[PDB]
Amino acid sequence: QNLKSTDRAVQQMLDKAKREGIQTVWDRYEAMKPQCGFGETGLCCRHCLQGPCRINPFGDEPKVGICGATAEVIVARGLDRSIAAGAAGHSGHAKHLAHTLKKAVQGKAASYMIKDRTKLHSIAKRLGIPTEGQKDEDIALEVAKAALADFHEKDTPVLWVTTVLPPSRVKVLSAHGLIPAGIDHEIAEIMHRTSMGCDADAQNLLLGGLRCSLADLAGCYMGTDLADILFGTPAPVVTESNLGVLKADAVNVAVHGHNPVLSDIIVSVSKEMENEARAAGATGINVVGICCTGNEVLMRHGIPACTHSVSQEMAMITGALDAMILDYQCIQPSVATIAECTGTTVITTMEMSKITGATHVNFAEEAAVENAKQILRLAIDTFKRRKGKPVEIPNIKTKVVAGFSTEAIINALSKLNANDPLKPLIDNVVNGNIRGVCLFAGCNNVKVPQDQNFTTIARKLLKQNVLVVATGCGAGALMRHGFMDPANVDELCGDGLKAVLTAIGEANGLGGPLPPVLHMGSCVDNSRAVALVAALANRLGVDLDRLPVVASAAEAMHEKAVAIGTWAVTIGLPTHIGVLPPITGSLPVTQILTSSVKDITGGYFIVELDPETAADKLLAAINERRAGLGLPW
Amino acid sequence: QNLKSTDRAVQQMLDKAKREGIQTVWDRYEAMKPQCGFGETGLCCRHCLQGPCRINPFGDEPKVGICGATAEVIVARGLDRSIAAGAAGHSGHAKHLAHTLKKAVQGKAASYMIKDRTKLHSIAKRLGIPTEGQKDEDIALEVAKAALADFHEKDTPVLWVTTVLPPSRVKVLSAHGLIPAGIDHEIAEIMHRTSMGCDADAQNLLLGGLRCSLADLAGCYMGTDLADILFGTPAPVVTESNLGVLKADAVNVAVHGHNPVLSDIIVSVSKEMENEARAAGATGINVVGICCTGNEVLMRHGIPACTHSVSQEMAMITGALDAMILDYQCIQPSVATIAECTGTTVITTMEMSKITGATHVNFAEEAAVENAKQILRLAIDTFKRRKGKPVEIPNIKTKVVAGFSTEAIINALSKLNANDPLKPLIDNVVNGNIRGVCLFAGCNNVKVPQDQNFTTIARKLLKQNVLVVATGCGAGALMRHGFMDPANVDELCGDGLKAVLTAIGEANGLGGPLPPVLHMGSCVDNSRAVALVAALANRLGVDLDRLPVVASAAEAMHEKAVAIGTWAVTIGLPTHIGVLPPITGSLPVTQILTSSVKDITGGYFIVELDPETAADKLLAAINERRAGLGLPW
Ligand code: SF4
Ligand code: SF4
Ligand code: FES
Ligand code: FES
Ligand SMILES: [Fe+3]
Ligand SMILES: [Fe+3]
Ligand SMILES: [Fe+3]
Ligand SMILES: [Fe+3]
Ligand SMILES: [Fe+3]
Ligand SMILES: [Fe+3]
Ligand SMILES: [Fe+3]
Ligand SMILES: [Fe+3]
Ligand SMILES: [Fe+3]
Ligand SMILES: [Fe+3]
Ligand SMILES: [Fe+3]
Ligand SMILES: [Fe+3]
């Protein structure tokens, strides 16, 4: 089972699923092998009904699609569509929050409000929205309107790109025509240009993809901005992670998906129904997190994270998961069938994301509190049904310090230098105590033993004094293996990094250091890392492609991860991906994405499936940036 | 070669390509066989990097995608993405025209203007835009603004849906949640909901697809509206079609693609450079059409159609095609490589549609006349280079009467009844002289001998007194086989249909009848057939799903055709498709699309690859509608 997951709780539940005959994601993967080599390399096209077309990676015919589409075109078109689909997910999440904020301040949804007035005003300032002499509800209405306007063409480009990157970066991107005109506009243009008989030049196609990836970044940054206004900007918080945060004697309710518009309300409402649960025989309602919706409520409320990504079914296998509350994205639809065997009540809540066999609750912000109590009652009902059943909850959990929004990191740093808070970080980059910064992002992937790349790479970078930040299921992997527990700093961190985390932790009234890895939040909160890096760039007066900052989508899976990886490259970062994206069937495309793009944006992909090699390549990229700045390394 | 194309000109050029060693679309098809059965049935998914996932149509594992996605989900998700891609193409075309109109009336592009003032005012009226006391430029500015606003969410739904269908149809669609909120909004929502771990209920997915197909219809109808304002509403015109419209002693220039924003200007400008060509040794500039951009200038200017769809490469094989001027959609990228062997200058003009090896001219409406003269000079240059080369132009062409916009059909009918022009048509439906109406739409497809389904089906329907209208490459097929020549009415048409076409033709000062098939224009001009059918519905006081009207995408290929077929079903029509869409891998999805959808929209797909059987099924559908109206049949 350690070939399937490096997480010991997951291994224990894999043994249980096996003896109970419950099929898992790993079983369905084994049943899918050998996978199709045309698809894996990108050399398959189904964009018209003359297809499917395939191209032999090597050998004889077929060498070209039926319409004349070359390997280069087919691979670039497929990649572009994955970027657009990712942009559609992150920006659909952000669009939903924009409508939620508008509803809140127009009086149409009392469960929602402006919780972070400071963030609201700073966003308005960044966008050029006048605040002086405005009431907060009118400022927020203007902010929501601007958010919705970035989805279509207008007299300005997408402001959630142009106002969040350094002007010098915006200038480089505009010179290449890469600034998106509108988020949904770019998504539609990708779908058009990649349809049959349209764009058929790999470089032209890929430039479109980079522009669409910046539409994805805009949606991520919008999502983070709006969720912080509505639900509060995260600050440092202490909690726990892994299956051992389930409790047999409580009603265990997982919030799973990406958009916390409802799961933030579920958190609040569950706290008040602690007595309706006590009357059903439970100690209380135990809300736990899965995937990014879990990250959102972990970052803001300290809700413990139960599990992530590829292992999400295992939470159910314990027998203790009374309800799983779903919004959208990264939910294995197998959960609706596994629930028949584990007793979990699986509940969908979003109109465009239903699963056959799952109960559906038509959530509306106008009715959020009522929907939440309806769902929590089903959970309580489900707890009642398992009175006297034995559960197998692995008694395995880690301590997690998290909540490191960019505002929180700057505040923590300000305790070492109140009026120039980035300077202590830059000072230690310069003197070598911090070699560089690496962002771990993305998903787990059944092809990679769960968490093996994240932890292998993180370990090598940390010993080399790299400051590691993480989001999404990269943060989930690292938290479940103890990388967010400050007690592990001595074991994990080089002496220079230890000294810096210790200095900052002690200065913030903490028993000791910051944790080994800084959890910056959900997948849309990759935007927070952009905020941090853009702020460092502006403090140093250089562009992002001169900073010793890298990114690693160490076990990527979702179209969203392809979009993120692509905008990481577009804003100027060396960007590792530890699973094969479907590009190797075209050497020209691969050479653009791993080399020539350097000359356009300064970033570039590092495709490397061996995690020790990937760490060495990420270190070399960091050290090359250091040398470009004239710094020792 | 008759196994490849039923067009004798195409056969002759296929012989030439063979002896010259030029690879064609049919050669690349033969090299692709046997095609992948997972893809053909829809049982393949590459929506995340755990894939590719396939599902065996029958047998043992794999039975389910790695994430748990069932055959039903995978097939519905793939279909939805094809609908969204089609919507992206038609609506990108319309969006471009909207920006063109706005530029024209804001003084920023003198080559463009309001040519059809009557159409402008009627559109404004339909949309609720006040005209009384407005100048035309301000009305048109408002119309263009409304067009652009339909691409995003706003306080109204998409008006180019809700103002173009009968209120009773709009009510049925709203009751099922099928009215699109915004064109690019729906495209993005499809891409989101079909991404990994989101929507996983076949019925929910397919309802999303029907809504997105109405976003496609809106883009088609917008495109037709705006092109008519800018370039004129078509009226009956006489011209010719097939390769014999090439002339060895002229500069032959093909306009190819879909959006005529530039090719309409090329038509005008070529007429004035007739003397610059004469000085290079040519008789003049001979502009000819390929595919839908060709249909646009055929409908408006009588430009002869050279060829269509699957056989587009054959125009080049003659050796006489000096230039091929490309915008986007349905262009085989092989043309850029075949040009090296035929001497044709292939020119791209749209920034998001380039082809490696083709010359690119950065067309801007602000510079249209200058771009056109630049391109026509390259063509003249190319004619000079083939002084004294022999060409092989098959001496094969047909006579084509076309230009049957809905306005033109109503006007033609008005000569039989001035104040109730639809009544003569309805009278003859009721008395059986017209059994029903069939719209032929869509592409050719290399899998089907070129034109065989269009002509086989058309022949049977016409002998049974069906009024046949056609668009796009369905119109192209029928024109090249003589179905738009009124001299063939006696051979092709039943006595009742003949009597009606004769009555109308004679009443419109014509030597004789209307042609056997009414050419209603390009692919976006499928919207014209909707206008006609909606007008008939409103005159009778019934909804479209009670009218004896059917549609046939007899040889479909492009994602656009899937979108059209789907909105034909959604607005209430029995809709034949003569190639297999990728749905047969899921019986539940197939049963929804061919049966249960009847109960939602009244329309339904008829999947039938044998054209004689398909004609029988279309006749049965027409006759069932007749019986529902209480009419003989
Ligand atoms: S778009 Fe071209 S390569 Fe793709 S399926 Fe169609 S014919 Fe094949
Ligand atoms: S979305 Fe599901 S079915 Fe599709 S490739 Fe990924 S794991 Fe396979
Ligand atoms: S041939 Fe397998 S992915 Fe298409
Ligand atoms: S397995 Fe062939 S289309 Fe994917
Ligand atoms: Fe995740
Ligand atoms: Fe996530
Ligand atoms: Fe993620
Ligand atoms: Fe992910
Ligand atoms: Fe994910
Ligand atoms: Fe993610
Ligand atoms: Fe066509
Ligand atoms: Fe067409
Ligand atoms: Fe067509
Ligand atoms: Fe077509
Ligand atoms: Fe076409
Ligand atoms: Fe078409």
mmCIF file with all atom_site columns, N, CA, C and O in Angstrom, chain A residues 556-576:
data_model
loop_
_atom_site.group_PDB
_atom_site.id
_atom_site.type_symbol
_atom_site.label_atom_id
_atom_site.label_alt_id
_atom_site.label_comp_id
_atom_site.label_asym_id
_atom_site.label_entity_id
_atom_site.label_seq_id
_atom_site.pdbx_PDB_ins_code
_atom_site.Cartn_x
_atom_site.Cartn_y
_atom_site.Cartn_z
_atom_site.occupancy
_atom_site.B_iso_or_equiv
_atom_site.pdbx_formal_charge
_atom_site.auth_seq_id
_atom_site.auth_comp_id
_atom_site.auth_asym_id
_atom_site.auth_atom_id
_atom_site.pdbx_PDB_model_num
ATOM 1  N N  . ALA A 1 556 ? 0.789  17.117 -10.208 1.00 0.00 ? 556 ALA A N  1
ATOM 2  C CA . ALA A 1 556 ? -0.349 17.812 -10.791 1.00 0.00 ? 556 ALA A CA 1
ATOM 3  C C  . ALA A 1 556 ? -1.358 16.836 -11.405 1.00 0.00 ? 556 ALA A C  1
ATOM 4  O O  . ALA A 1 556 ? -0.995 15.785 -11.925 1.00 0.00 ? 556 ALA A O  1
ATOM 5  N N  . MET A 1 557 ? -2.633 17.235 -11.386 1.00 0.00 ? 557 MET A N  1
ATOM 6  C CA . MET A 1 557 ? -3.702 16.447 -11.991 1.00 0.00 ? 557 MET A CA 1
ATOM 7  C C  . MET A 1 557 ? -4.699 17.270 -12.809 1.00 0.00 ? 557 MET A C  1
ATOM 8  O O  . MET A 1 557 ? -4.955 16.956 -13.973 1.00 0.00 ? 557 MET A O  1
ATOM 9  N N  . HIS A 1 558 ? -5.272 18.305 -12.213 1.00 0.00 ? 558 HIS A N  1
ATOM 10 C CA . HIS A 1 558 ? -6.438 18.982 -12.768 1.00 0.00 ? 558 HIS A CA 1
ATOM 11 C C  . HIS A 1 558 ? -6.043 19.988 -13.840 1.00 0.00 ? 558 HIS A C  1
ATOM 12 O O  . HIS A 1 558 ? -4.925 20.507 -13.865 1.00 0.00 ? 558 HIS A O  1
ATOM 13 N N  . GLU A 1 559 ? -6.976 20.232 -14.750 1.00 0.00 ? 559 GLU A N  1
ATOM 14 C CA . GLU A 1 559 ? -6.815 21.308 -15.735 1.00 0.00 ? 559 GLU A CA 1
ATOM 15 C C  . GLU A 1 559 ? -6.456 22.624 -15.050 1.00 0.00 ? 559 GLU A C  1
ATOM 16 O O  . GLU A 1 559 ? -5.687 23.404 -15.601 1.00 0.00 ? 559 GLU A O  1
ATOM 17 N N  . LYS A 1 560 ? -6.975 22.866 -13.840 1.00 0.00 ? 560 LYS A N  1
ATOM 18 C CA . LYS A 1 560 ? -6.622 24.060 -13.070 1.00 0.00 ? 560 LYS A CA 1
ATOM 19 C C  . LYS A 1 560 ? -5.134 24.125 -12.795 1.00 0.00 ? 560 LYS A C  1
ATOM 20 O O  . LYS A 1 560 ? -4.528 25.206 -12.836 1.00 0.00 ? 560 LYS A O  1
ATOM 21 N N  . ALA A 1 561 ? -4.516 22.967 -12.527 1.00 0.00 ? 561 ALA A N  1
ATOM 22 C CA . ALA A 1 561 ? -3.084 22.962 -12.266 1.00 0.00 ? 561 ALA A CA 1
ATOM 23 C C  . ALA A 1 561 ? -2.293 23.299 -13.510 1.00 0.00 ? 561 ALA A C  1
ATOM 24 O O  . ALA A 1 561 ? -1.239 23.944 -13.419 1.00 0.00 ? 561 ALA A O  1
ATOM 25 N N  . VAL A 1 562 ? -2.753 22.850 -14.680 1.00 0.00 ? 562 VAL A N  1
ATOM 26 C CA . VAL A 1 562 ? -2.081 23.227 -15.914 1.00 0.00 ? 562 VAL A CA 1
ATOM 27 C C  . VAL A 1 562 ? -2.170 24.737 -16.112 1.00 0.00 ? 562 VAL A C  1
ATOM 28 O O  . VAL A 1 562 ? -1.188 25.387 -16.479 1.00 0.00 ? 562 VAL A O  1
ATOM 29 N N  . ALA A 1 563 ? -3.347 25.318 -15.866 1.00 0.00 ? 563 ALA A N  1
ATOM 30 C CA . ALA A 1 563 ? -3.476 26.768 -15.968 1.00 0.00 ? 563 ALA A CA 1
ATOM 31 C C  . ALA A 1 563 ? -2.520 27.478 -14.999 1.00 0.00 ? 563 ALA A C  1
ATOM 32 O O  . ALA A 1 563 ? -1.842 28.431 -15.378 1.00 0.00 ? 563 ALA A O  1
ATOM 33 N N  . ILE A 1 564 ? -2.476 27.046 -13.742 1.00 0.00 ? 564 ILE A N  1
ATOM 34 C CA . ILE A 1 564 ? -1.589 27.693 -12.764 1.00 0.00 ? 564 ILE A CA 1
ATOM 35 C C  . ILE A 1 564 ? -0.136 27.570 -13.201 1.00 0.00 ? 564 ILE A C  1
ATOM 36 O O  . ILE A 1 564 ? 0.645  28.535 -13.151 1.00 0.00 ? 564 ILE A O  1
ATOM 37 N N  . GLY A 1 565 ? 0.273  26.369 -13.573 1.00 0.00 ? 565 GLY A N  1
ATOM 38 C CA . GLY A 1 565 ? 1.646  26.189 -14.024 1.00 0.00 ? 565 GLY A CA 1
ATOM 39 C C  . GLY A 1 565 ? 1.974  27.128 -15.165 1.00 0.00 ? 565 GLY A C  1
ATOM 40 O O  . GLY A 1 565 ? 3.039  27.769 -15.178 1.00 0.00 ? 565 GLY A O  1
ATOM 41 N N  . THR A 1 566 ? 1.023  27.301 -16.075 1.00 0.00 ? 566 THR A N  1
ATOM 42 C CA . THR A 1 566 ? 1.250  28.159 -17.231 1.00 0.00 ? 566 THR A CA 1
ATOM 43 C C  . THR A 1 566 ? 1.328  29.638 -16.828 1.00 0.00 ? 566 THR A C  1
ATOM 44 O O  . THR A 1 566 ? 2.130  30.388 -17.400 1.00 0.00 ? 566 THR A O  1
ATOM 45 N N  . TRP A 1 567 ? 0.470  30.115 -15.904 1.00 0.00 ? 567 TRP A N  1
ATOM 46 C CA . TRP A 1 567 ? 0.641  31.531 -15.552 1.00 0.00 ? 567 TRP A CA 1
ATOM 47 C C  . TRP A 1 567 ? 1.840  31.736 -14.656 1.00 0.00 ? 567 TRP A C  1
ATOM 48 O O  . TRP A 1 567 ? 2.419  32.806 -14.688 1.00 0.00 ? 567 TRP A O  1
ATOM 49 N N  . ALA A 1 568 ? 2.266  30.716 -13.905 1.00 0.00 ? 568 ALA A N  1
ATOM 50 C CA . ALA A 1 568 ? 3.527  30.856 -13.186 1.00 0.00 ? 568 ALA A CA 1
ATOM 51 C C  . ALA A 1 568 ? 4.660  31.112 -14.159 1.00 0.00 ? 568 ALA A C  1
ATOM 52 O O  . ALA A 1 568 ? 5.499  31.979 -13.930 1.00 0.00 ? 568 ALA A O  1
ATOM 53 N N  . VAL A 1 569 ? 4.663  30.406 -15.289 1.00 0.00 ? 569 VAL A N  1
ATOM 54 C CA . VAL A 1 569 ? 5.655  30.626 -16.322 1.00 0.00 ? 569 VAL A CA 1
ATOM 55 C C  . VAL A 1 569 ? 5.484  32.006 -16.929 1.00 0.00 ? 569 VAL A C  1
ATOM 56 O O  . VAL A 1 569 ? 6.469  32.717 -17.182 1.00 0.00 ? 569 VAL A O  1
ATOM 57 N N  . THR A 1 570 ? 4.236  32.395 -17.187 1.00 0.00 ? 570 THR A N  1
ATOM 58 C CA . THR A 1 570 ? 3.973  33.656 -17.863 1.00 0.00 ? 570 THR A CA 1
ATOM 59 C C  . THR A 1 570 ? 4.387  34.859 -17.025 1.00 0.00 ? 570 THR A C  1
ATOM 60 O O  . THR A 1 570 ? 4.873  35.852 -17.582 1.00 0.00 ? 570 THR A O  1
ATOM 61 N N  . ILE A 1 571 ? 4.248  34.792 -15.695 1.00 0.00 ? 571 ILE A N  1
ATOM 62 C CA . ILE A 1 571 ? 4.676  35.922 -14.870 1.00 0.00 ? 571 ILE A CA 1
ATOM 63 C C  . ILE A 1 571 ? 6.170  35.888 -14.557 1.00 0.00 ? 571 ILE A C  1
ATOM 64 O O  . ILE A 1 571 ? 6.679  36.829 -13.935 1.00 0.00 ? 571 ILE A O  1
ATOM 65 N N  . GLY A 1 572 ? 6.899  34.878 -15.016 1.00 0.00 ? 572 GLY A N  1
ATOM 66 C CA . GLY A 1 572 ? 8.356  34.909 -14.991 1.00 0.00 ? 572 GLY A CA 1
ATOM 67 C C  . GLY A 1 572 ? 9.063  33.891 -14.115 1.00 0.00 ? 572 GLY A C  1
ATOM 68 O O  . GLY A 1 572 ? 10.270 34.015 -13.874 1.00 0.00 ? 572 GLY A O  1
ATOM 69 N N  . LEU A 1 573 ? 8.354  32.841 -13.682 1.00 0.00 ? 573 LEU A N  1
ATOM 70 C CA . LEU A 1 573 ? 8.934  31.854 -12.778 1.00 0.00 ? 573 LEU A CA 1
ATOM 71 C C  . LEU A 1 573 ? 9.380  30.555 -13.445 1.00 0.00 ? 573 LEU A C  1
ATOM 72 O O  . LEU A 1 573 ? 8.648  29.974 -14.274 1.00 0.00 ? 573 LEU A O  1
ATOM 73 N N  . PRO A 1 574 ? 10.531 30.008 -13.066 1.00 0.00 ? 574 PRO A N  1
ATOM 74 C CA . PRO A 1 574 ? 10.792 28.595 -13.356 1.00 0.00 ? 574 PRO A CA 1
ATOM 75 C C  . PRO A 1 574 ? 9.782  27.742 -12.618 1.00 0.00 ? 574 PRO A C  1
ATOM 76 O O  . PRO A 1 574 ? 9.616  27.886 -11.396 1.00 0.00 ? 574 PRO A O  1
ATOM 77 N N  . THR A 1 575 ? 9.158  26.794 -13.336 1.00 0.00 ? 575 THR A N  1
ATOM 78 C CA . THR A 1 575 ? 7.947  26.135 -12.858 1.00 0.00 ? 575 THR A CA 1
ATOM 79 C C  . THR A 1 575 ? 8.074  24.643 -13.128 1.00 0.00 ? 575 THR A C  1
ATOM 80 O O  . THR A 1 575 ? 8.068  24.207 -14.287 1.00 0.00 ? 575 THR A O  1
ATOM 81 N N  . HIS A 1 576 ? 8.266  23.881 -12.069 1.00 0.00 ? 576 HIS A N  1
ATOM 82 C CA . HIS A 1 576 ? 8.423  22.447 -12.178 1.00 0.00 ? 576 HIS A CA 1
ATOM 83 C C  . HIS A 1 576 ? 7.042  21.813 -12.256 1.00 0.00 ? 576 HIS A C  1
ATOM 84 O O  . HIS A 1 576 ? 6.117  22.219 -11.550 1.00 0.00 ? 576 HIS A O  1
#
